[PDB]
Every structure is written in C-alpha cells, then in structure tokens.
Design a protein around this ligand. Sequence first.
Ligand SMILES: CCCCCCCCCCCCOS(=O)(=O)O
Ligand SMILES: CCCCCCCCCCCCOS(=O)(=O)O
Length: 159
Amino acid sequence: GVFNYETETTSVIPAARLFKAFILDGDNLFPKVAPQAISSVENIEGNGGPGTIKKISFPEGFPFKYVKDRVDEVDHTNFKYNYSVIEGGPIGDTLEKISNEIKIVATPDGGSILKISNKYHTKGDHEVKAEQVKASKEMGETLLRAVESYLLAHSDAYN
Ligand SMILES: CCCCCCCCCCCCOS(=O)(=O)O
Ligand SMILES: CCCCCCCCCCCCOS(=O)(=O)O
C-alpha cells in the first residue's frame, strides 16, 4: 500500500534559479554546500533525464549509509521534479519505494514556494513512522537552506 505525505516551504530564491540549482544541479551543490548532510553524489547511469540513477552517500554516523534515487520526470517549464528512492537506506523488506514529487512556484515578492509530495510504497503492510518522514523533511530543509545561502552569496551562479 501507499502512505501519502505532503508539506510546503518557502524560498527567498526565484523559482527558475532555485530549480536550476537546488533541483537540477544537486549533484554538484549538495556535497559542496552541505558536506555534513551529504558526503557525495554519484551518477550510476543516465544524464539527468528520466531513468537516471544516482547514489547519494551520507556522512559517517548517519542512520543510513546511502540511497539510490531514480529520476522519474523533469519538467523545466513548470519546475516539476519527480524522483524515487529505489534502493538503500529505508528500502528493503518493509519498504519497496519512495516516490517523490517536487513543484516550485514563483511568488510576486521574488521568492518561491516548494510543494513536495512523498509516497511510501510498502510491501507487506509495514507502518511508516512519523520520525522517518520528519527526519527526511529535516534533511530536505537543511539542503534547501544551505543551497539558498550559497545562491545569495554567489550572485553569478545559475543565472
Ligand atoms: C541518512 C538520511 C537521513 C538524514 C537525516 C538528517 C537530518 C538532519 C540533517 C542535517 C545534518 C547536518 O546539518 S548541518 O547543519 O551540519 O549541515
Ligand atoms: C521542506 C523540506 C523539503 C525540501 C525539498 C528537498 C527535496 C530534495 C531535492 C533533491 C533533488 C535531487 O534528487 S536526486 O537524487 O534525484 O538528484
């Protein structure tokens, strides 16, 4: 079955610039701006388009060693990014896949709004724990703020 989780957050970065950096160049930025959140990002196969497999390794002492994500869909026009956690970390005999959908909307003040949907695909009927989702939300938030700060301090990047 599927557990559906949802949340929203704001950014001081315009939608397109944030999408280009935070979403489309997370491979480069995450290990650079938040090394104590993500140690490395490895392209296993593909470009960045649908089907691309990436291996995200976490620092020593983290609850998980790594996860492998698969790019599902990339919409440059509507700033939509869909990806799935397909292996590692929480994935195993209790959890088959986590399908994520991200959308970034412009706001008139020059910022943006992020809408993220998480779907936990469980096999035999595990329960998904509140502290698992809450941890994942904290990770995403840490990544966003660290990228945000970088983009404020590096005006020439991702224009
Ligand atoms: C293994 C996947 C689950 C990880 C949960 C981590 C939540 C907190 C992430 C910030 C840690 C570091 O934050 S930082 O302020 O030093 O950059
Ligand atoms: C409200 C806190 C949540 C903010 C959203 C954070 C989502 C992380 C984006 C990773 C995109 C890159 O993922 S990738 O493995 O496919 O390259």
